[PDB]
């Protein structure tokens, strides 16, 4: 999983695709998505 405020889904993204065990993968823009 990702950390808090980290990335979980973007066009230029390769890190953890799931958000922190206390954070949620909420999409931002069609090129960026982060963990809250
Ligand atoms: O995925 C989330 O939890 C993991 C541990 O269970 C961490 O490795 C990760 O970075 C996230 O916080
Ligand atoms: O979650 C923490 O680690 C991530 C990298 O795996 C970062 O993107 C994030 O901002 C935190 O530093």
Swiss-Prot record:
Disulphide bridges: 8-25, 19-35
Recorded superkingdom: Eukaryota
Transmembrane region(s): none
Subcellular location: Secreted
Residues carrying a glycan: 1, 3, 14
Post-translational modification: N-glycosylated. The catalytic core domain comprises three N-linked glycans which each consist of a single N-acetylglucosamine residue.
CBM1 domain mapped to chain residues: 1-36
Primary role: Exocellobiohydrolases (CBH) that catalyzes the hydrolysis of 1,4-beta-D-glucosidic bonds in cellulose to release the disaccharide cellobiose. The degradation of cellulose involves an interplay between different cellulolytic enzymes. Hydrolysis starts with endoglucanases (EGs), which cut internal beta-1,4-glucosidic bonds in cellulose to reduce the polymerization degree of the substrate and create new chain ends for exocellobiohydrolases (CBHs). The CBHs release the disaccharide cellobiose from the non-reducing end of the cellulose polymer chain.
Misc note: T.reesei produces two different exocellobiohydrolases. They are unique in that they can hydrolyze crystalline cellulose in the absence of endoglucanases.
Domain notes: The enzyme consists of two functional domains, a catalytic core joined to a carbohydrate-binding domain (CBM) by a serine-, threonine-, and proline-rich, highly glycosylated linker sequence.
Family: Belongs to the glycosyl hydrolase 7 (cellulase C) family.
Stated name of the protein: Exoglucanase 1
């Amino acid at each position: 999983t990702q950390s808090h405020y980290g990335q979980c889904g973007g066009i230029g993204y390769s890190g953890p695709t799931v958000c922190a065990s206390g954070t949620t993968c909420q999409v931002l823009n069609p090129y960026y998505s982060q963990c809250l």
